[PDB]
């Protein structure tokens, strides 16, 4: 049991004497009056305190082989059904995001963010990022926060946080004086708490400057390096980020690029694998459908279940797809296309296509192959990943 856990303790209430008052051959002795008159106690008095002696502890209300053995034959059958399912992409999207009307591409991007790529270690020992980062920009009336809420209530080990900090440690970490030791110690932030998980950062445009700087290291190198008085540390932050942000002045303008519509700097922009934009169209049929869906969710409600998707995700994430040679050629040609296309706006403030976007294409194709439980990435996976990435570039430009 760990501090903060709510646990049921089964055992005995017992009584523990003040043992410092007792003198014995083994060891000699060191506002209410205790009981008196024992030989071991001498002229002193013995006080008591109540202590619970737990024979059992459990929570109060709760490897690859390990997964396989833990789960049941019916769960195996359901996993196999999902692995063989046609339209699995859209089925998982609809199952994860029932309240969301439309935004089917954003649903796909968030699903691949959940599946994630394959982390790798270079020959020299440096690590290549496997996690996928996604940012959803949109007007405050759009579904940007609802995507984060659905992800957080679906996935285990995930954190929801605002860009503005509720604590001295915001997103990354802080150094604070211990109240018991009077000594500087780490206070963990949202990314550290979301290590090997998903961090859903709402109002990402409103970060404090310490987080605005340290998120650079946290998003790409997946570490938080601290060098302060009393503490030197490298803290693991191996997290996938799902950010949500507002345009400057509170509404989006399609005539302007995303770089002009949000306050994120180019280094921060380069970290994200996918960007999405939500504009509140004043379309009567869309409002009609939104009201229908919401009130149906409140009144009538009282494909796949979230537990089934949890089991399938946990099963599928253990796959490590490999790159076929033809899919490698497809990735190379697609990146050449993307880069030479970006050359038409590199002089005019485009979301310039760095090498991080090549590696984001690699990550997204690997996530596709993981979703299909494939041993090897294929040109179909590369094409779908390129579709999402390319559409993000085009929507970012206009």
């Amino acid at each position: 049991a760990q501090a903060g856990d709510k646990c049921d303790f089964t055992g005995t209430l017992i009584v523990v004497p003040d043992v410092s008052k007792l003198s014995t051959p083994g060891a000699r002795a060191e506002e209410t009056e205790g009981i008196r008159g024992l030989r071991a106690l001498g002229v002193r008095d013995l006080s008591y305190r109540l202590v619970f002696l737990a024979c059992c502890v459990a929570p109060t209300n709760p490897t690859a082989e390990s997964i396989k053995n833990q789960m049941t034959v019916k769960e195996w059958e359901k996993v196999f059904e999902m692995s063989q399912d046609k339209n699995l992409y859209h089925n998982l999207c609809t199952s994860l995001f029932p309240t969301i009307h439309g935004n089917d591409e954003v649903k796909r991007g968030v699903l691949l963010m959940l599946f994630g790529g394959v982390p790798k270690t270079t020959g020299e020992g440096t690590s290549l990022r496997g996690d996928i980062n996604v940012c959803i920009v949109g007007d405050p009336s759009t579904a940007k926060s609802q995507f984060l809420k659905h992800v957080e209530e679906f996935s285990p080990r995930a954190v929801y946080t605002s860009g503005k900090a509720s604590s001295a440690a915001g997103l990354t970490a802080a150094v604070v004086r211990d109240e018991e030791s009077h000594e500087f110690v780490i206070e963990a932030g949202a990314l550290m708490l979301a290590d090997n998980g998903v961090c859903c950062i709402d109002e990402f445009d409103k970060m404090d400057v310490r987080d605005q700087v340290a998120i650079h290291e946290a998003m790409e190198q997946q570490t938080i390096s601290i060098t302060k008085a009393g503490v030197k540390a490298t803290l693991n932050a191996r997290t996938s980020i799902l950010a949500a942000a507002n345009p400057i002045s509170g509404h989006y303008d399609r005539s302007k690029s995303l770089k002009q519509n949000i306050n994120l700097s180019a280094p921060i922009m380069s970290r994200f694998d996918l960007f999405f934009i939500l504009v509140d169209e004043c379309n009567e049929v869309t409002d009609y459908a939104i009201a229908r869906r919401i009130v149906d969710l409140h009144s009538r409600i009282e494909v796949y279940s979230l537990d089934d998707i949890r089991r399938y995700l946990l099963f599928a994430r253990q796959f490590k797809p490999k790159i076929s040679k033809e899919s490698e050629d497809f990735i190379v040609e697609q990146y050449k296309h993307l880069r030479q296309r970006d050359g038409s706006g590199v002089t005019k403030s485009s979301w310039r296509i760095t090498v991080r976007q090549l590696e984001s294409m690699i990550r997204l194709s690997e996530a596709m192959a993981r979703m299909h439980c494939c041993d090897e990435v294929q040109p179909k996976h590369v094409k779908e990943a390129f579709r999402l990435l390319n559409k993000s570039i085009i929507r970012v430009e206009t």
Binding site: A27, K120, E124, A229, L235
Partner: protein, 703 residues
Amino acid sequence: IESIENLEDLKGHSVREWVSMAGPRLEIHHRFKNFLRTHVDSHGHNVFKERISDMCKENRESLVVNYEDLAAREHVLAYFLPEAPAELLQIFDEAALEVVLAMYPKYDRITNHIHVRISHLPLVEELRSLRQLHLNQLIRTSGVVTSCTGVLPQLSMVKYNCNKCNFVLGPFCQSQNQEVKPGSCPECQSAGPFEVNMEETIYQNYQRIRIQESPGKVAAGRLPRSKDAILLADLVDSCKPGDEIELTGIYHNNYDGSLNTANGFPVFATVILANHVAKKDNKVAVGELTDEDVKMITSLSKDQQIGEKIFASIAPSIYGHEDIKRGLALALFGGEPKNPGGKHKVRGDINVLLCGDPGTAKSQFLKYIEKVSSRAIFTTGQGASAVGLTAYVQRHPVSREWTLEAGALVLADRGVCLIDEFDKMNDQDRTSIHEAMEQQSISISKAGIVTSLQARCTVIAAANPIGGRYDPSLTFSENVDLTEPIISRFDILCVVRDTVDPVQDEMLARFVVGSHVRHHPSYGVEPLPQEVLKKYIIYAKERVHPKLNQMDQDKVAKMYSDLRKESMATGSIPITVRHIESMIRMAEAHARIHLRDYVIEDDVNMAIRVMLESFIDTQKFSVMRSMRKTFARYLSFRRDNNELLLFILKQLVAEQVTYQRNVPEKDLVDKARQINIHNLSAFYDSELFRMNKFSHDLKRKMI
């Protein structure tokens, strides 16, 4: 005592008493002696002859035995060792002393005991996972050293003067458990205020360290567990606060009344009796290098293309950036500190600044340097402070007097400090490193402490320009936002750009996708393996020291003078006087890369090239070409000189033909040493003799 043919049949005993009795004790003694004498490695080399010889060369009193070798060669000793570690380590120490005095009969003058240390024990444990089942067993743990006492003298075999008569009480052994009380004098029975005989008492070095779980192995928001460990004899000062270590030792418990009264239950204090400390930083020390390793290093230095190999070995998973790899290689190997006349210190370390666009592998370069280098400190932007970088004063945790403590720059004193997001720092935090960057010291005057610490590190920083995108319309000074005092403190100043170029983009994409294929969980010149590179680096840094005899002062002086002129013209970068000393440092670093004991014009030309190319890189687009032709035509980009050796060869052939008509390679190299053109291997690889139909052979020596 008859030899015991089977130690393995305990015959109902436990291991402790079984090895404590005489028969199995002598059998273990003989087996360990035979193991030390006869154990050979995969090449057939007697490893322990070499190890004991090195130990006796260096007077080190301690012998590291690999548990893998012990388990492979002599099974039952490896079987009993973790079960009864104190007893078997005592027997091993006795046997090792016998073998050592067989090899070196006079080593008793240097030592009276040999400590056998055990390494690579498979019984690895997490600190959070130690249980009562591990008590009195040899465990292996990992953690960060968070506290250290000073090296203190501890009684080991103590003698007491009698409080009344002149008798001295017999040798009593100290236990680590309790104070030894003398008892009563056997001459007269007095038991009064006895006192230690300091001169006849035997002491041992003592140091108590506290280790805790490493901060990256503890969970976020969770408090770390910790253990005390006792270091005795030559294990003291094996580590300092902040060191990541692996600790092999006996997990030991004893009664503590303080814990009993704190808990209300008979809880026993625990401590680790350390047997072997190995810093996870220094996986290979200079003492670990074997004759095979140094033979490999020295023979590999004779390749004569080793500079290109060493440059290519810097971050082998990064395409391109040859200038970055060159600068980082020079910084990683480093120059020599000098102090002419004992009154004028100049730094030997080379500082590097990588400025440029996002997604250009600057951080990956920094993490590579962190991984490859011993004594690497990594820090980032707002995560650093002036105080944390340099040094900090605190109340001591227990005694509460003000005490100075080491910051990152002090902890990296003979290593590398890596500062990512360098432009994102505060000015107050960034100005702290000036003294450490140039004067290589940190002077603190706080709370009664007035002292200077050594901070002789090499700073490698990464930064972005203003707006997160480099602008060729502007110079470096116009788009960096840093100021002249900090800009001038960086010897090598690199600009990395992410401009579109389709052929390079295609090649880079193929390299990146190939890297992702190669590293799945499963330039031309070829690099070294990284293990070999690490061994090569530490040998080059510690066993080799370049010395400058001459460097053709006119060339560098004229270069510096007109580099100052053009810097004043464009305003791109301040040049001050530090660039001259950067030239000397880079030349020494290249000499160290080649393992030269003396610097030469090859190294000087390399340093000249690095300086001129980086300065040209600081310029604008239009200005850059004019600067290129300026410094290229007038100053020294000494690529090659094949024409002189070509016509020397032609002259020698013409004279030889004229002599014969009416050993040429020896004639050629004789003339090549007479003239200052000694780098003849370049001519033998070049085309200029080949299309003129000459050829060479080191055996026949005909051309």
